[PDB]
Amino acid sequence: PISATMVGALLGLGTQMYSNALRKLPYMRHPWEHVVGMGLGAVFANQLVKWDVKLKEDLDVMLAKARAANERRYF
């Protein structure tokens, strides 16, 4: 389907083309950089997904402690 890897690869390729266009260069100037950008974007998207999962776990632990501290009031 629409995995993180594909979204990241597309974003990285688009980032290399956008950069070339902002510099008035042909869209495909230095194609090996387009390959590098695809790889880096894929890696970044997958790592962002993993980091988001980890963040949620940490937040749940923090929210559990906050609710325990708040429930201590009614003791």
Binding site: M28, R29, H30, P31, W32
Partner: protein
């Protein structure tokens, strides 16, 4: 077509990558010869699949520019500094025809002013030095004066003569055996038989002269000049 154009584009990506790799390899060996500014002029230049088709017995000066779909026939000659650009349409040159030094034979760059007319040059035609032909037909055995300009739509009927420095306005027809000249081009007089003989004999003399120049240009490049340029201080 479109698929050929896509393969041509993707091909350029592979070539760009390979040439970059070669430059890397030369850099690791401490060579900078790829930084040398050498002329990228091509005597015959293609624009995708529109390439020039030149007969083997046609002389083309190395400094001349033949771009796109250009047809040069047998015994014809493209002299020093000439430019022929048929890209939006075609440019065809007949046999035994001389296009003299610094002449420009091209078609309209854009179709904004209507459909782009091709340029047709007939047989045994003489085109004088620094003449401008722009989307016009020039029939067989005609004489285009040097420094003259022919605009799109013009027809120079067989045995027509355009005087040196003339400006033949758009869509003008030059009848046979007439000499037209001036800006704007206007009928001057009729062509005499001696001048017809001169037309044909001049086209023949230039075919022999083209042959002589082709042999001196095809002589192998001299190594001594190369070593002198290389060892300068």
């Amino acid at each position: 077509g479109t698929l050929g154009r896509a393969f041509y584009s993707v091909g350029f990506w592979i070539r760009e990558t390979g040439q970059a790799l070669d430059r890397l390899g030369c850099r690791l060996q401490g060579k900078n010869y790829f930084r040398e500014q050498l002329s990228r002029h091509r005597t015959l230049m293609n624009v995708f699949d529109k390439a020039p088709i030149v007969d083997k017995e046609a002389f083309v000066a190395p400094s001349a520019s033949v771009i796109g779909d250009v047809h040069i026939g047998r015994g014809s000659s493209i002299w020093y500094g000439c430019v022929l650009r048929g890209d939006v349409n075609t440019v065809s040159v007949g046999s035994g025809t001389n296009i003299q030094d610094n002449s420009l034979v091209h078609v309209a760059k854009s179709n904004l002013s209507g459909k782009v007319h091709p340029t047709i040059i007939g047989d045994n035609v003489t085109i004088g030095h620094s003449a401008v032909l722009h989307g016009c037909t020039v029939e067989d055995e005609t004489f285009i004066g040097m420094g003259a300009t022919l605009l799109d739509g013009v027809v120079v009927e067989k045995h027509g003569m355009v005087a040196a420095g003339a400006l033949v306005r758009q869509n003008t027809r030059i009848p046979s055996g007439e000499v037209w000249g001036g800006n704007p081009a206007r009928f001057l007089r009729k062509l005499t038989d001696e001048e017809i003989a001169f037309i044909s004999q001049s086209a023949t003399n230039y075919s022999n002269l083209a042959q002589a120049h082709a042999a001196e240009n095809a002589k192998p490049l001299n190594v001594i000049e190369f070593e002198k340029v290389l060892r300068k201080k």
